[PDB]
Amino acid sequence: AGKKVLIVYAHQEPKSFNGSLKNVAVDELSRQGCTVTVSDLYAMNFEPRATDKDITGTLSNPEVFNYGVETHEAYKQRSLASDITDEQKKVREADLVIFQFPLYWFSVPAILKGWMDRVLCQGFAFDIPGFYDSGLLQGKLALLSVTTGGTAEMYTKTGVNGDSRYFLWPLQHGTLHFCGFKVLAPQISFAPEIASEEERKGMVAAWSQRLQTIWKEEPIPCTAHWHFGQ
């Protein structure tokens, strides 16, 4: 069990709850002897915008810019911007990719959305054909570790926000599964801002605890039924 983990981390403040979850991941995975890398997006001033700056070569059509076409061709030619290919190396080497982030509008913060848009390009993360179970990152695991303002009860079928799993669909299925990841069950730390000090440490320790045995876990069945029920 010599494993490589990439944590893609998206919080502005090292002393945040997200920051603590990120750090206990690094501590506990390091302790196990795993190889660990963190992409700290805000600290890298990570570029989120999909633009023609992401290709440095001769464009396939320089008069009508098609991001998807130009990045696919640029990946094959190796003329992608280097901040993109630096992240791809990290992914390629990883056995597990953990995403650590606060929920922003039922989704990831824009800086991490940009990571997904720019890094997971055609040719690297998927092809046509070559997606979902035939996606190019098959054999890798991914895991969303999410924090929320709202409560667990708010994130139920009958609660105001609907079930937590509803908002996971575009990320777990439309992105990770599409790229061929197997998806481990999400870690959702609900409403730490509201929680007591003891409840906070508890949530942190539950994460650290889960990580002790993460390599023994099976992935979820990443299906409409899992996310939405019958």
Ligand X SMILES: COc1cccc2c1C(=O)c1c(O)c3c(c(O)c1C2=O)C[C@@](O)(C(=O)CO)C[C@@H]3O[C@H]1C[C@H](N)[C@H](O)[C@H](C)O1
Ligand Y SMILES: Cc1cc2nc3c(=O)[nH]c(=O)nc-3n(C[C@H](O)[C@H](O)[C@H](O)COP(=O)(O)OP(=O)(O)OC[C@H]3O[C@@H](n4cnc5c(N)ncnc54)[C@H](O)[C@@H]3O)c2cc1C
Output the smallest distance, CB 211 to ligand X, in A. 26
Rounded CA separation 227/172 (Å): 9
Q: What are phi and psi of 206, to 5 degrees?
A: -65, -35
- Interaction residues for Zn ion, span 108-127 (CB under 5 A): none
Residue with tokens 């508890």: 202
Residue whose CB is nearest to ligand Y in the complex, by number: 149
By C-alpha distance, which of 44, 54, 185 is closest to 112? 44
**CA 161 distance to own-chain centroid:** 22
Q: Kindly report whether the peptide bond that precedes residue 129 is cis, defined as omega within 30 degrees of 0.
A: yes
35 marked as binding residue:
no
* Cα distances (Å, whole numbers) of residue 137 to 91, 123, 180: 9, 11, 5
Site for ligand Y (CB under 6 A): which residue of 57, 149, 152, 157?
Answer: 149
Stretch of residues binding Zn ion (CB under 5 A), selected from 30-38, 89-97, 101-109, 216-224: 216-224
- Interaction residues for ligand Y, span 204-223 (CB under 6 A): 204
- Is residue 65 close enough to count as binding a second copy by CB under 8 A? yes
Output the smallest distance, CB 15 to a second copy, in A. 5
Interface ranges with a second copy (CB under 8 A): 12-13, 15-16, 42, 45-46, 48-52, 63-68, 104-111, 113-114, 116-118, 120, 132, 149, 157-158, 160-163, 166-167, 169-171, 173-175, 178, 224, 227-228
